[PDB]
Amino acid sequence: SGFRKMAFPSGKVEGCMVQVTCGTTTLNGLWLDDVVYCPRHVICTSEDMLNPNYEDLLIRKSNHNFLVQAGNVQLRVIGHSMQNCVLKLKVDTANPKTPKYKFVRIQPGQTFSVLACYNGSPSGVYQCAMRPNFTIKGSFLNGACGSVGFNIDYDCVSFCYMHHMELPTGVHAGTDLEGNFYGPFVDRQTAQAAGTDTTITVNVLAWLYAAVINGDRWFLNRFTTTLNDFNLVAMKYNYEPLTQDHVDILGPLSAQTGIAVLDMCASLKELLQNGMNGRTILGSALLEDEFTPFDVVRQCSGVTF
Amino acid sequence: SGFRKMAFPSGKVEGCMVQVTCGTTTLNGLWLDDVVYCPRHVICTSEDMLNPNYEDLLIRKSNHNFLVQAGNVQLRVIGHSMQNCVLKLKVDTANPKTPKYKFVRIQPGQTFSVLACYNGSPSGVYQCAMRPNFTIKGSFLNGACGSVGFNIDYDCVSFCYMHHMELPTGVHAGTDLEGNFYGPFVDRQTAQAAGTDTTITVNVLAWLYAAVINGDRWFLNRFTTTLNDFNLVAMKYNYEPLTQDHVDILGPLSAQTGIAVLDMCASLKELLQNGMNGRTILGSALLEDEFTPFDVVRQCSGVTF
Ligand SMILES: *C(=N)[C@H](C[C@@H]1CCNC1=O)NC(=O)[C@@H]1[C@@H]2[C@H](CN1C(=O)[C@@H](NC(=O)C(F)(F)F)C(C)(C)C)C2(C)C
Ligand SMILES: *C(=N)[C@H](C[C@@H]1CCNC1=O)NC(=O)[C@@H]1[C@@H]2[C@H](CN1C(=O)[C@@H](NC(=O)C(F)(F)F)C(C)(C)C)C2(C)C
Ligand SMILES: [Cl-]
Numbered sequence: 001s002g003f004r005k006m007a008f009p010s011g012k013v014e015g016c017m018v019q020v021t022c023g024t025t026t027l028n029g030l031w032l033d034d035v036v037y038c039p040r041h042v043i044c045t046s047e048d049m050l051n052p053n054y055e056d057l058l059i060r061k062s063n064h065n066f067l068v069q070a071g072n073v074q075l076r077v078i079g080h081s082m083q084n085c086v087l088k089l090k091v092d093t094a095n096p097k098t099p100k101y102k103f104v105r106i107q108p109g110q111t112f113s114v115l116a117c118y119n120g121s122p123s124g125v126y127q128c129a130m131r132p133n134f135t136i137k138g139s140f141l142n143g144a145c146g147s148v149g150f151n152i153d154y155d156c157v158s159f160c161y162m163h164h165m166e167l168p169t170g171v172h173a174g175t176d177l178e179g180n181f182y183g184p185f186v187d188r189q190t191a192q193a194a195g196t197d198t199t200i201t202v203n204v205l206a207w208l209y210a211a212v213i214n215g216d217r218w219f220l221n222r223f224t225t226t227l228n229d230f231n232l233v234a235m236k237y238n239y240e241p242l243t244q245d246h247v248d249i250l251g252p253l254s255a256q257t258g259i260a261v262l263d264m265c266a267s268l269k270e271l272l273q274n275g276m277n278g279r280t281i282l283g284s285a286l287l288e289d290e291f292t293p294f295d296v297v298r299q300c301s302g303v304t305f
Numbered sequence: 306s307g308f309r310k311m312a313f314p315s316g317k318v319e320g321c322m323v324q325v326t327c328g329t330t331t332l333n334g335l336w337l338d339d340v341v342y343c344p345r346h347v348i349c350t351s352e353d354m355l356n357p358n359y360e361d362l363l364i365r366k367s368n369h370n371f372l373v374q375a376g377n378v379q380l381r382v383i384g385h386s387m388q389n390c391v392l393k394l395k396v397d398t399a400n401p402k403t404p405k406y407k408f409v410r411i412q413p414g415q416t417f418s419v420l421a422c423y424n425g426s427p428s429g430v431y432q433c434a435m436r437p438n439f440t441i442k443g444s445f446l447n448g449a450c451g452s453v454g455f456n457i458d459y460d461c462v463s464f465c466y467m468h469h470m471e472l473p474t475g476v477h478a479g480t481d482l483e484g485n486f487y488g489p490f491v492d493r494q495t496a497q498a499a500g501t502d503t504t505i506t507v508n509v510l511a512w513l514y515a516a517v518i519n520g521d522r523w524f525l526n527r528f529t530t531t532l533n534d535f536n537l538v539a540m541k542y543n544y545e546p547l548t549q550d551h552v553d554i555l556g557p558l559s560a561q562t563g564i565a566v567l568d569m570c571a572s573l574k575e576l577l578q579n580g581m582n583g584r585t586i587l588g589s590a591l592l593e594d595e596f597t598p599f600d601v602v603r604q605c606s607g608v609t610f
Contacts, residue, residue, distance in 0.1 A: 170306030
């Protein structure tokens with residue numbers, strides 16, 4: 001029993017982290033086979049980053065201008081291209097610790113682990129949701145850029161995030177590993193704000209199922225609702241619409257606990273209308289939306305890698 | 306910016322995890338050099354665990370009775386002893402992935418990362434506090450026993466916890482790596498409950514400093530208090546006494562923010578007496594006590610391993 005915010009084990013990703021230095025800018029890179037992927041703004045100075053021309057700054061760099069270090073071993077760059085907002089540095093050495101991997105673009109609502117790195121050295125690991133406004137609620141200092149987010153499925157690491165920047169209110173924005181931003185953000189230092197966020201309804205339901213499984217049951221009411229009736233009340237409290245795909249994805253938790261998704265919807269509608277009256281669920285005084293149905297099943301049925 | 310529950314990177318510990326099978330019982334072991342450490346109740350059946358005689362059950366085991374697997378490689382046991390509640394199995398192979406390590410017994414109030422493992426395979430990593438009642442608030446299913454808790458200091462893994470059991474209310478109990486229980490718990494299936502818990506005052510203060518650093522400042526009042534006056538109000542809300550050692554440990558955060566520890570004490574006393582009036586701190590509607598002063602500095606100043 002017990003329910004925790006739980007990251008994937010980071011060992012497979014730790015063996016891929018390197019330091020990339022260009023001019024005086026240092027940040028993190030991801031070394032897979034004979035390629036190092038990092039944020040393209042490594043080729044900028046302070047001045048540059050207000051409104052940089054990246055294609056221009058890159059024309060003017062040799063292979064030798066990029067210093068890539070894995071521990072106190074220097075990798076020799078033998079090639080450099082740009083793909084959207086990501087730099088690819090071909091190196092003379094294939095990373096012998098390359099795991100089985102894929103590059104994935106996740107949807108809003110999906111969780112992943114961040115390995116927070118400084119100078120190519122891992123600082124910590126924590127779990128994050130891609131918010132509907134295409135931000136994450138991370139913990140990143142100066143030098144954290146090139147830190148990656150990932151999922152693990154048995155042996156395969158799916159990389160879905162690379163860290164680029166911090167927005168007002170200390171939320172974070174970044175790219176897939178093909179260098180395309182999540183959301184409408186750009187890699188320059190200008191006025192950018194997140195759209196207002198919404199609550200990921202399917203994740204709150206997944207969390208309510210985790211509470212039931214762990215014996216926290218006080219909020220269960222004796223009522224049902226229609227999907228339509230639920231989605232009208234959800235809308236007022238800035239909750240995402242719940243789709244039929246969402247209902248089908250909650251099937252396993254529903255079948256495990258014997259509570260129909262629309263019965264849990266009735267329970268959530270009451271918590272939204274009446275609040276929690278100073279009571280907690282799984283130790284929390286707020287409804288939690290950063291656990292997916294898959295994360296609840298993992299943790300509550302003990303899936304390993 | 307941002308403040309997250311953040312685990313240590315688990316790679317160094319992942320390379321030490323093995324599966325231990327004795328009879329039909331399987332659980333996790335920690336393989337360091339040529340020794341595998343696991344919970345001694347691996348030598349029990351269901352029946353045994355109500356009131357087992359461990360010295361007796363062990364007399365009757367050969368080296369060959371212990372099946373130790375690291376992936377799909379079997380390690381040959383060549384020696385077996387018991388140290389308190391932990392089994393030591395000498396094996397024929399030194400673990401080539403053994404990190405620099407120490408065995409440490411932590412004090413109540415201290416945090417660590419748990420690597421939750423099933424069948425010798427890592428499931429997830431999360432951060433935990435040793436509670437004043439000598440429990441942790443973990444997430445452990447059947448087969449999680451032998452899962453370890455650790456801290457990392459640059460290159461050195463300090464192992465401080467091995468998981469043994471779950472107590473009523475789904476809190477967890479275990480040993481140091483010398484096999485001595487934290488708290489008054491025993492490794493048998495009987496009536497055992499945790500003492501009532503208390504709030505780790507020094508950790509709540511560390512967290513309030515993290516809030517200030519992240520720009521969450523609404524709860525700062527214009528008042529000071531005496532240590533004596535603070536500890537009287539703390540006592541009513543089931544908060545630990547704050548000692549002078551606690552004040553000295555908070556010095557760095559105090560000097561960084563320019564708020565005297567006794568000024569933050571005045572701010573916490575007001576939150577305890579008046580509550581939060583429906584406001585949040587670092588996203589939380591409850592005061593958090595599972596970040597140490599060291600954890601706050603790590604995260605807010607970017608320490609790596
Ligand atoms: C890479 N190491 C940093 C990581 C940042 C620094 C503070 N915390 C983080 O997560 N990335 C940057 O410094 C990027 C970089 C230029 C500006 N920048 C920002 O994150 C800035 N943000 C913005 O300009 C805004 F508002 F658009 F989000 C900053 C003001 C420094 C927080 C580039 C190329 C985007
Ligand atoms: C080892 N894999 C398990 C881990 C447990 C199982 C459920 N979640 C966990 O964290 N350890 C045990 O099964 C230990 C084991 C016998 C009983 N046990 C317990 O944790 C039991 N607890 C207690 O008897 C009590 F109340 F004292 F805590 C159980 C009722 C199964 C939860 C031994 C040797 C202690
Ligand atoms: Cl909360």
